[PDB]
Design a protein around this ligand. Structure first.
Ligand SMILES: CCCCCCCCCCCCCC(=O)SCCNC(=O)CCNC(=O)[C@H](O)C(C)(C)COP(=O)(O)OP(=O)(O)OC[C@H]1O[C@@H](n2cnc3c(N)ncnc32)[C@H](O)[C@@H]1OP(=O)(O)O
Ligand SMILES: COc1cc(C)c(S(=O)(=O)Nc2c(C)nn(C)c2C)c(C)c1C
Ligand SMILES: [Cl-]
Length: 411
C-alpha cells in the first residue's frame, strides 16, 4: 500500500489498467485558476530553488547531487554519472520552462538536497490501434479517437533525494510541487519512467546489453563468464574473440549528421515513429537539439546516398561510477537513441552503431526493448539484463501495451 500514490490520479492496480479501453484523463478537469499560486509548504529549514540551467555553477551543483545520489543498480555496484554537458542538453531543450526544474536547498548553507525536472514533450498518446479496432467492432470509435491529437505534456526525469534525507517523505513533496508548477502552465498529463514498480505501468521493457569491452565488463562484474566457457582452455580470449568488431563502419556513405540534414532526418524519423502507439512528435529545432552531435553527449550518423539521407542512427553517453572496484573509475556506456532505416536492414544499420561506439572507447551498448530493438538482438549479440524500464503516465488512463509499441526514448 502506498500512502502517497493512492492519493494521485494514476491507476492503482494491474487490475485497473488491464481493464482500461480508451485513452483519457483521470482527474476532474481543472483550470490554472484552480491551482495554488504559492509553492507547496515545506519545513522552515529548507527552501525551494529554481536552478538556472545556463549557469555552469547551478548545473554543477545538480551534477554533484546526481553523481553522489542518483540511480544505483540493486547490488550497489554502479551509479550514473551524467556529465554537466549532458545535464544542460537534457534539461534545456527548445522552449523549456525553467520553472519546471525543481530543487530543495537547505536554507542555511544552500546545500542542494533534492531535485526533479520536467521538460516539455509533444506526445501521441491516444487509444492504441488494437483497442481502436475493438472500438469499431463495438460502435464506440468516437470515444476511442477523442484524444488522438498530439498533446503538449511534461516529461519527468532526474528525481533524486540526497542519501541522508531518504525515507523522510520528501519525494512526495517534490512531486506535488512539480505537479503544481506544471499545472500552473496549463499542462495536466506527464510521462515518466522508472526501474522500479509503481502504480501503475502501461508498458514494461527489459534491458539489453552489448559488450564492446568484455574483459573490463567481467572485471567490474557487469558481466559473468558463462559456465560453457569453463570447458574451454582460455576463457577470456574466447570471450574477447566472440564480441570483436570491425574498426571501421561497413555502410559506404555513413558520416556524422550536420545541420543541413535536419529536415530529412525529421521526415524519416516521423514516418517511422508514426507506426507506434506511444511516441513523440519533434519539430526541426527539436531534431537539431536532440540529434545534432555534441561531444561526450550525443553521437549521430546518417546514411547519405545521392545527396539523400535514407538512414540514420544515434546514441548517447552515460558513464556509470564503478562503486566497489578501485582499478576503474567508470563504465563508459552508449545508449541506443532514435534511428530509422529505409534502405538497409536495421541489423545492418545498428552494426555500424556498435562499431562506432567501440572505436570511440565505449565499454557497452545498452537499450530497452522498445521501438524495433528486438529485431537485432540475436544477430548483434545483445543479451537480456536483469532490469526493466516501466513506462508511466500521470493523470492519463492508458491500456496495457507491449514495449514494442513504445517509441519514446528516455534520457
Ligand atoms: C501534470 C504534471 C505531473 C508531474 C508529476 C508526474 C509524476 C512524477 C513521478 C516521479 C517520476 C520519477 C522518474 C525518475 O526519475 S526514476 C529515477 C528515480 N531516482 C532514483 O532512483 C535516484 C535514487 N533514489 C532516490 O533519490 C530516492 O530513493 C527517490 C527520490 C527515488 C525516492 O525517495 P525516498 O526513497 O527518500 O522515499 P520518500 O520517503 O521520500 O518517498 C516515498 C514515496 O516515494 C515513492 N517512490 C519511490 N521511488 C520512486 C520513483 N522512482 N518515482 C516515483 N516515486 C517513487 C514511493 O513509492 C513512496 O510513495 P508511497 O508508496 O508511500 O505512495
Ligand atoms: C533505469 O533503470 C535501469 C537502468 C540501467 C542502465 C540498468 S543497467 O544497465 O542494467 N545497469 C546499470 C548501470 C551500468 N548503471 N546503473 C546506474 C545501472 C542501474 C538497470 C538494471 C536499470 C534497472
Ligand atoms: Cl536509462
Amino acid at each position: 500500500a502506498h500512502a502517497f500514490w493512492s492519493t494521485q490520479p494514476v491507476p492503482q492496480t494491474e487490475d485497473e489498467t488491464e481493464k482500461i479501453v480508451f485513452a483519457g484523463p483521470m482527474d476532474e478537469p481543472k483550470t490554472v485558476a484552480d491551482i495554488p499560486e504559492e509553492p507547496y509548504p515545506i519545513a522552515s529549514t529548507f527552501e525551494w530553488w529554481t536552478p538556472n540551467m545556463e549557469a555552469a555553477d547551478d548545473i554543477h551543483a545538480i551534477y554533484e547531487l546526481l553523481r553522489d545520489n542518483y540511480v544505483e543498480d540493486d547490488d550497489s555496484m554502479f551509479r550514473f554519472n551524467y556529465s554537466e554537458e549532458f545535464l544542460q542538453w537534457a534539461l534545456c531543450p527548445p522552449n523549456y520552462i525553467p520553472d519546471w526544474h525543481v530543487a530543495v536547498r537547505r536554507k542555511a548553507d544552500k546545500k542542494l538536497l533534492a531535485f526533479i525536472a520536467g521538460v516539455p514533450v509533444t506526445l501521441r498518446m491516444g487509444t492504441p490501434k488494437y483497442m481502436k479496432v475493438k472500438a469499431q467492432e463495438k460502435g464506440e470509435g468516437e470515444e476511442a479517437a477523442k484524444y488522438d491529437e498530439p498533446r503538449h505534456i511534461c516529461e519527468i526525469n532526474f528525481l533524486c533525494v540526497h542519501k541522508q534525507l531518504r525515507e523522510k517523505r520528501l519525494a512526495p513533496i517534490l512531486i506535488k510541487e512539480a505537479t503544481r508548477r506544471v499545472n500552473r502552465t496549463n499542462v495536466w498529463q506527464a510521462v515518466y519512467t522508472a526501474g522500479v514498480l509503481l502504480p501503475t505501468p502501461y508498458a514494461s521493457g527489459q534491458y539489453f546489453h552489448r559488450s564492446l569491452n568484455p574483459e573490463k565488463l567481467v572485471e567490474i562484474r557487469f558481466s559473468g563468464i558463462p559456465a560453457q566457457y569453463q570447458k574451454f582452455q582460455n576463457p577470456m580470449a574466447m570471450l574477447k574473440r566472440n564480441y570483436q568488431l570491425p574498426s571501421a563502419p561497413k555502410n559506404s556513405g555513413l558520416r556524422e549528421m550536420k545541420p543541413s540534414d535536419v529536415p530529412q532526418v525529421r521526415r524519416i524519423l516521423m514516418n517511422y515513429l508514426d507506426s507506434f502507439d506511444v511516441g513523440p512528435v519533434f519539430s526541426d529545432a527539436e531534431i537539431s537539439h536532440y540529434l545534432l552531435p555534441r561531444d561526450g553527449v550525443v553521437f549521430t550518423y546518417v546514411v547519405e546516398n545521392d545527396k539523400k539521407v535514407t538512414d540514420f542512427f544515434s546514441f548517447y553517453r552515460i558513464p556509470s561510477t564503478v562503486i566497489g572496484n578501485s582499478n576503474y573509475n567508470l563504465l563508459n556506456a552508449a545508449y541506443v537513441h532514435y534511428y530509422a532505416a529505409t534502405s538497409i536492414p536495421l541489423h545492418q544499420l545498428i552494426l555500424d552503431l556498435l562499431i562506432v561506439a567501440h572505436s570511440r572507447g565505449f565499454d557497452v551498448c545498452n537499450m530497452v526493448e522498445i521501438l524495433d530493438n528486438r529485431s537485432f538482438v540475436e544477430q548483434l549479440k545483445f543479451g537480456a539484463g536483469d532490469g526493466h524500464l516501466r513506462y508511466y503516465f500521470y493523470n492519463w488512463a492508458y491500456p496495457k501495451i507491449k514495449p514494442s509499441q513504445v517509441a519514446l526514448v528516455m534520457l
